[PDB]
């Protein structure tokens, strides 16, 4: 089973809402800025958040 976590989803949503222009559809850039802008200390969790914010930005640009 592979389902995203509650706190991961909430953190991604609040991050994208707070910084609309600081993320794009690039996973590497989202990862860098998530590490920079979050108190996360786990690489796995940071990758989780980065991937989900990339997904959210893709949905936004799609409409």
């Amino acid at each position: 089973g592979k389902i995203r976590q509650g706190f991961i989803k909430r953190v991604a949503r609040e991050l994208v809402n707070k910084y609309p222009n600081e993320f794009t559809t690039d996973f590497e850039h989202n990862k860098k800025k998530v590490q920079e802008l979050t108190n996360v200390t786990s690489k796995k969790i940071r990758n989780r958040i980065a991937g989900y914010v990339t997904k959210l930005v893709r949905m936004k640009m799609e409409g």
């Binding site: 706190f7 953190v11 991050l15 802008l37 979050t38 108190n39 996360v40 786990s42 969790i45």
Partner: protein, 195 residues
Amino acid sequence: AIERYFIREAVREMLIDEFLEKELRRAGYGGLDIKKTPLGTKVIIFAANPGYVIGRGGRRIRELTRILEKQFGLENPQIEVEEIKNPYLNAKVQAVRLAQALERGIHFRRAAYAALRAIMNNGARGVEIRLSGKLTGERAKSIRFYQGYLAKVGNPAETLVSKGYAQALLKLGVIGVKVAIMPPGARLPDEIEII
């Protein structure tokens, strides 16, 4: 070998701690620290009531040093007594106090609720107290009082929380008291926020 020295030191600290726990039950014992100095050894004992630890005239401290040196084999020990940083956050001390209250004869429900409220108001994310034994009748029971946030599974529950256990010897038998406290300032991995 080097491991043999590590093991002997750990075992000696063990036996000293157990003996002191037996001796200083009414002194609000919280723990000890043993350090080596060129002259000998120094032992710091954390007690909520250093009055009992020191005694009257220093006879208790003199005899305690005598025993801890001869019986336990420590080399030229000097004993100092210090205050607990916060008795309401040390699980062992709270468990001992609750057991002593039960021995005194306070109703278990009232004592548990009072201790829980005091611990919560003194600053703690969460607390849980479990009382097991012959309560309310001949058939033993096990009742838990809980408040706040707590963790019991995983490395955070193994490390962050402080746990203590004590035995209250009443007239009808032994009551087991277990206390778990989550100290303030402890952050679980699930808690992250923007900086």
